[PDB]
């Protein structure tokens, strides 16, 4: 059964609700982004209207084989009418194609659903500036003050400088980056750019990247592993055993591996700064865990909500325990009392 926090009141709409069969009363299914916990249930046999971004629609058609007649892509930053209700899609600063959805209810209520997002001050100058928002369905992934991490720009500077130093010292070193979903493409693209290389990957991963409308992509990625010194592998293979095995396959072209695992937050953020990050090393293999987040930090989330001043907040993450729900509710009240709304 579909949970209450995936239903939009006063409409026939659900959000990220594809794993519950036919939802009673649902005339249109919205999909915020192409991550598996959100699309779970979609396939070539789905026959209801799906509303999403252009990029998300490309992935639905090519990766899940959803029939074109049921895919309804909408442009961003543009007022659209869906089943008699005005809606707007806004960039979520998450992965490629990810959106927030603004719903203008017939009765005058305005609802913002953030999907998954990384809050940024630039959102304060979008179409959100124009009107009041009554209810906020919020990505609360990191809603506690221990969740600190650096800017994406600082993390990429560290990665570029690290990779460039290592390969300039040893021209026979290979760089490897882990992936298991779309998102965080800047990590591998920025490293390849500084090294003058294309990024090598499987046919399946190449297909996925070709769906993302990234400018000049044909100049940056390849399926020819032998021509490339930046390789993408499944996140599960980024360990000493898996990387040793990969180095064997490269046929003595390389004699060292520098590997990156772009996690979200890990507890080592509480002690260390990005500049002081060090790898785990065994022989000629080194692995860096880098805190590249596509979700709001606690402080970023707090700033966004105190700017927006919603009348009611509905969390969409960490909803399953009473301890998590109580913790989040206490922070929402603090934020309201500090700001005066
Ligand atoms: C999500 C986040 C930010 C924005 C903006 C604000 N823009 C300011 C102008 C300079 C750079 C572009 C960004 C418009 N729509 C958005 C959706
Ligand atoms: Ni996501």
UniProtKB/Swiss-Prot annotation:
Q: In which tissues is it expressed?
A: Expressed in brain, heart, kidney, liver, pancreas, placenta and skeletal muscle.
What does the entry say induces or represses the expression of this protein? During mitosis. The mRNA encoding this protein contains an internal ribosome entry site (IRES) in its 5'-UTR. This 5'-UTR generally suppresses translation while specifically promoting expression during mitosis, when cap-dependent translation may be impaired.
Regions annotated as coiled coil: none
Q: Which domain of life is it from?
A: Eukaryota
From the Swiss-Prot or TrEMBL record, state where the protein is found: Nucleus
Instruction: State the function annotated in the UniProt record.
Output: May be required for DNA interstrand cross-link repair. Also required for checkpoint mediated cell cycle arrest in early prophase in response to mitotic spindle poisons. Possesses beta-lactamase activity, catalyzing the hydrolysis of penicillin G and nitrocefin. Exhibits no activity towards other beta-lactam antibiotic classes including cephalosporins (cefotaxime) and carbapenems (imipenem).
Protein family (similarity comment):
Belongs to the DNA repair metallo-beta-lactamase (DRMBL) family.
How this chain assembles, per its entry, is: Binds constitutively to TP53BP1. Binds CDC27, which is itself a component of the anaphase promoting complex (APC). Binds PIAS1.
What is the name listed in the Swiss-Prot or TrEMBL entry for this protein? DNA cross-link repair 1A protein
Give the lineage: Eukaryota, Metazoa, Chordata, Craniata, Vertebrata
């Amino acid at each position: 059964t579909c949970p209450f926090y995936k239903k939009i009141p006063g409409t026939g709409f659900t959000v990220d609700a594809f794993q519950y069969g036919v939802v009673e009363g649902c005339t249109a299914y919205f999909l915020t982004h192409f991550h598996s916990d959100h699309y779970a249930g979609l396939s070539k046999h789905f026959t209801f209207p799906v509303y999403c971004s252009e990029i998300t629609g490309n992935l639905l058609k090519n990766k899940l084989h959803v029939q074109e007649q049921y895919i309804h892509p909408l442009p961003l930053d543009t007022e659209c009418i869906v089943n008699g209700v005005k809606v707007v899609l806004l960039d979520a600063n998450h992965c490629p194609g990810a959106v927030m959805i603004l719903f203008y209810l017939p009765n005058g209520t305005v609802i913002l659903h953030t999907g998954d997002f990384r809050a940024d001050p630039s959102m304060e100058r979008s179409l959100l500036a124009d009107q009041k928002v009554h209810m906020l369905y919020l990505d609360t992934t990191y809603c506690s003050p221990e969740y600190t991490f650096p800017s994406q720009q600082e993390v990429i500077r560290f990665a570029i400088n690290t990779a460039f130093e290592a390969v300039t010292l040893n021209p026979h070193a290979l760089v490897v980056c882990g992936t298991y979903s779309i998102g965080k493409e800047k990590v591998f693209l920025a490293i390849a750019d500084v090294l003058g290389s294309k990024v090598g990957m499987s046919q399946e991963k190449y297909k996925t990247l070709q769906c993302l409308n990234i400018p000049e992509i044909n100049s940056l990625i390849t399926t020819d592993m032998c021509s490339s010194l930046v390789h993408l592998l499944p996140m599960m293979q980024i360990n000493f055993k898996g990387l040793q095995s990969h180095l064997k396959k490269c046929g003595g072209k390389y004699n060292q591996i520098l590997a990156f695992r772009p996690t979200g937050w890990t507890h080592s953020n509480k002690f260390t700064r990005i500049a002081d990050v060090i790898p785990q090393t065994k022989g000629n293999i080194s692995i860096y865990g880098i805190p590249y987040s596509e979700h709001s930090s606690y402080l970023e989330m707090k700033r966004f909500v105190q700017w927006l001043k919603p009348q009611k907040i509905i969390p969409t993450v960490n909803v399953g325990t009473w301890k998590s729900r109580s913790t989040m509710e206490k922070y929402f009240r603090e934020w309201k009392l500090e700001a005066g709304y």
